[PDB]
Amino acid sequence: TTEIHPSCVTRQKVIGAEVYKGMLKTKKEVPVAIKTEKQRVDFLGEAGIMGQFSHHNIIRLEGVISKYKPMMIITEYMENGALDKFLREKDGEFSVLQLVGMLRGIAAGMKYLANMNYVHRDLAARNILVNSNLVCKVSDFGLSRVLEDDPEATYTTSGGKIPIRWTAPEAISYRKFTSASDVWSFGIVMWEVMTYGERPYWELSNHEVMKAINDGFRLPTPMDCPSAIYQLMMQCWQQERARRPKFADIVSILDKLIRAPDSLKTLADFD
Numbered sequence: 001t002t003e004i005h006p007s008c009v010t011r012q013k014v015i016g017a018e019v020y021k022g023m024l025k026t027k028k029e030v031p032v033a034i035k036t037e038k039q040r041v042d043f044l045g046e047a048g049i050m051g052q053f054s055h056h057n058i059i060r061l062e063g064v065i066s067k068y069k070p071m072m073i074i075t076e077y078m079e080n081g082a083l084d085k086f087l088r089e090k091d092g093e094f095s096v097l098q099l100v101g102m103l104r105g106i107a108a109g110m111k112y113l114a115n116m117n118y119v120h121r122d123l124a125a126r127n128i129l130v131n132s133n134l135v136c137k138v139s140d141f142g143l144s145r146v147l148e149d150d151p152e153a154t155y156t157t158s159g160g161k162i163p164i165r166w167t168a169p170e171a172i173s174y175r176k177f178t179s180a181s182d183v184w185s186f187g188i189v190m191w192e193v194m195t196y197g198e199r200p201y202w203e204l205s206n207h208e209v210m211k212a213i214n215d216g217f218r219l220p221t222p223m224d225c226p227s228a229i230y231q232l233m234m235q236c237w238q239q240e241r242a243r244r245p246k247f248a249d250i251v252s253i254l255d256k257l258i259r260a261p262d263s264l265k266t267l268a269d270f271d
């Protein structure tokens with residue numbers, strides 16, 4: 001990671017909550033997002049992992065401020081924010097081609113992480129940021145690791161929490177997290193994109209989802225979804241992780257559909 005010095009940094013507004021919008025001087029200045037004792041340890045820790053990543057579809061770490069207070073993790077800024085909220089907002093305005101391009105981008109980033117032997121564990125549209133060019137980039141806001149136990153509790157959460165509706169069965173039952181379980185999660189993300197941000201298994205409780213998945217049921221087709229796209233998510237949801245596509249097969253399959261777009265034709269796109 002690169003140590004940024006606080007003079008090139010200007011916080012401006014609180015985006016969420018802390019994560020600010022700011023400006024980073026590079027001459028020209030660029031806009032950035034700024035995230036600000038066990039909590040301090042993990043904070044600087046996560047930056048070290050981010051700094052190892054450099055890919056078009058992975059949130060880019062500009063640097064960190066670890067020698068001054070406030071301590072800061074600085075990334076590029078993603079104007080359009082989190083993909084799930086963004087799709088619920090643009091419900092219907094994108095073609096299948098544009099939606100499958102976002103999925104391609106997401107899979108490209110996930111192929112890069114798998115090549116690094118990095119297992120995400122929380123691949124979900126809420127962790128995908130979007131910029132003014134509709135480029136999608138994998139991120140991790142850390143909600144899986146938010147500590148809500150009492151500081152004197154007899155029993156504490158170990159292993160963090162899992163996103164039950166996004167997590168492969170083997171990872172739920174045996175904590176076997178691999179790129180293959182990320183691929184399952186990627187399938188859920190395809191369904192999220194294609195439904196413009198619907199809640200997976202919206203009619204079911206959490207326990208009913210685990211019971212549904214073990215009975216062989218999966219998310220239903222999205223409306224207006226081309227068959228090839230729904231086929232691919234179904235492949236992502238095979239129960240035996242070894243039969244799922246690799247993130248390389250995925251990027252490849254999406255590339256073939258995009259280059260032969262008649263396979264992405266859905267009547268709603270007809271004019």
Ligand SMILES: Cc1ccc(C(=O)Nc2cc(C(F)(F)F)cc(C(F)(F)F)c2)cc1Nc1nc(-c2cccnc2)nc2c1cnn2C
Pocket residue numbers: 015016017019032033034035046049050053058059073074075076077078079081082129138139140141142
């Ligand atoms: C400043 C910052 C710091 C950290 C991360 C991040 O991705 N951490 C991360 C990623 C990975 C990995 F694998 F994906 F690369 C692995 C890990 C692990 F696991 F190691 F910890 C951690 C993201 C940002 N920036 C944003 N975040 C938010 C935001 C909004 C509400 C709540 N939280 C965050 N909004 C933003 C931006 C940019 N624009 N906007 C509108």
